[PDB]
């Protein structure tokens, strides 16, 4: 098949920096017509993708000259000479030289900021939910950076991976941090069967993990 590999997956930048995003195809994108149908799109949250560069290096209508595309055959690069806030989003390369037409997996252009440790809060099941016959233990890991983070749940000192559901927010608009929510789902009998519940967060801001616990008592 014709695979499009976009690199990098995430690209943290400071406003003003230059950014370079690459796209490599498993086969030459030079089409039999002699044209190279490699294009670049930028997509923002809640919006459809917008065309930036078509046929390797042609800037599309209304696209600022800071954007430029280059490359040939199987290697392509999109360059933003001086990054602006409005450039933040996910970039996708798209090839229409071979059917099926395919998109790269996208590169997220994100804003860098100082590293920040997560504020971790753990919550036992509400009595309301307990009455209903269920049990969810919730843990929030708020305002951290970078987004890479590892959350582990421990029940009576034993690590639990099944029954865990995680959700992550997008980079925050005001402080540029990320937040995450993790929920350990259990049967009420299971929950009542154990006493110590722990939410453990491992982030690069510390050699030591942040631990939050409670005892059902």
């Amino acid at each position: 098949e014709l695979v499009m590999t976009q690199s990098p997956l995430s690209l943290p930048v400071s406003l003003g920096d230059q950014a370079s995003i690459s796209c490599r195809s498993s086969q030459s994108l030079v089409h039999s017509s002699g044209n190279t149908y490699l294009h670049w799109y930028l997509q923002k949250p809640g919006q459809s993708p917008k065309l930036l560069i078509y046929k390797v290096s042609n800037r599309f209508s209304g696209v600022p000259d800071r954007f430029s595309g280059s490359g040939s055959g199987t290697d392509f690069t999109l360059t933003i000479s001086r990054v602006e806030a409005e450039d933040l989003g996910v970039y996708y390369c798209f090839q229409s030289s071979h059917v099926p037409l395919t998109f790269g997996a996208g590169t997220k252009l994100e804003l860098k900021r100082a590293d920040a440790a997560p504020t971790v809060s753990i919550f036992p099941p509400s009595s309301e939910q307990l009455t209903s016959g269920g049990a969810s233990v919730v843990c929030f890991l708020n305002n951290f950076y970078p987004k890479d983070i590892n959350v582990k749940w421990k029940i009576d000192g034993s690590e639990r991976q099944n029954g865990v559901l995680n959700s992550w927010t997008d980079q925050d608009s005001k402080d540029s941090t990320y937040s995450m929510s993790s929920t350990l789902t259990l049967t009420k009998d299971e929950y009542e069967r154990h006493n110590s519940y722990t939410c453990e967060a491992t982030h690069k801001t510390s050699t030591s993990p942040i631990v939050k616990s409670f005892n059902r008592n």
Binding site: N35, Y37, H39, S48, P49, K50, L51, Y54, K55, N58, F60, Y92, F94, S96, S97, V99, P100, L101, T102, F103, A105, G106, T119, S121, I122, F123, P124, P125, S126, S127, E128, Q129, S132, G134, S136, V138, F140, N142, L165, N166, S167, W168, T169, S179, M180, S181, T183, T185, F214
Partner: protein
């Protein structure tokens, strides 16, 4: 140039999805129209296209259940996909082929499709109180379909709020939201989780109070 998808929103698995793309500002006899979808699990995927000339091209992985046609005089393109499965849940777009560049240039706003056998179900809203700043929460569990809107103190408390994307569990959605306020404001001052689920016409105002 303007493309607009008109679709069903909710579809049950095994059934079919029909979407009509109505275009304005240009002639279908002059520009081909592509269909592309987007889901978290598969990113952007091109489904097929109907060229100005009227011929079609499809992504081999869908051709067995996909059909695209158009009515040049009505400026409408018809998309129909059968035997939907849960992972066909996505945002479906039609986009204009920019002639000889073979790149999509004008896109429709997209129509969100959820493939699910689930029935409309209001959420269970559980307050999350602790077991300087204090973080309080709210668990909105077991609802369908998306979306629900969570606010704090009826929208009066907007800073320090994190509402997380819902996740699917047992075919129902569950999401949480956290708010962080100075500890000198809670519980001295009331903090409430406000949830609205349009589809089931329900709203829930859950006050967050200390435990035990």
């Amino acid at each position: 140039q303007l493309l607009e998808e008109s679709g069903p929103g909710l579809v049950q698995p095994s059934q079919s999805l029909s979407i009509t793309c109505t275009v304005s500002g240009f002639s279908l006899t002059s520009y081909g129209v592509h269909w592309v979808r987007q889901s978290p699990g598969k990113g952007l995927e091109w489904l097929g296209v109907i060229w100005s000339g009227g011929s079609t091209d499809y992504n081999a992985a869908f051709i067995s259940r996909l059909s695209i046609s158009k009515d040049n005089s009505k400026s409408q393109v018809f998309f129909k996909m059968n035997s939907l499965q849960a992972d066909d849940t996505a945002i479906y777009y039609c986009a204009r082929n920019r002639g000889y560049s073979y790149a999509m240039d004008s896109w429709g706003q997209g129509t969100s499709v959820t493939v699910s056998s689930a029935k409309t179900t209001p959420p269970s809203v559980y307050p999350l109180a602790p077991g300087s700043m204090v973080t309080l929460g709210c668990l909105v569990k077991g609802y369908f379909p998306e979306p629900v809107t969570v606010t704090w103190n009826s929208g009066s408390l907007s800073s320090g709020v994190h509402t997380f994307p819902a996740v699917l569990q047992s075919d129902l959605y569950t999401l949480s939201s956290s708010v962080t306020v100075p500890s000198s404001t809670w519980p001295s001052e009331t903090v409430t989780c406000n949830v609205a689920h349009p589809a089931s016409s329900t709203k829930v105002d859950k006050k967050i109070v200390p435990r035990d």
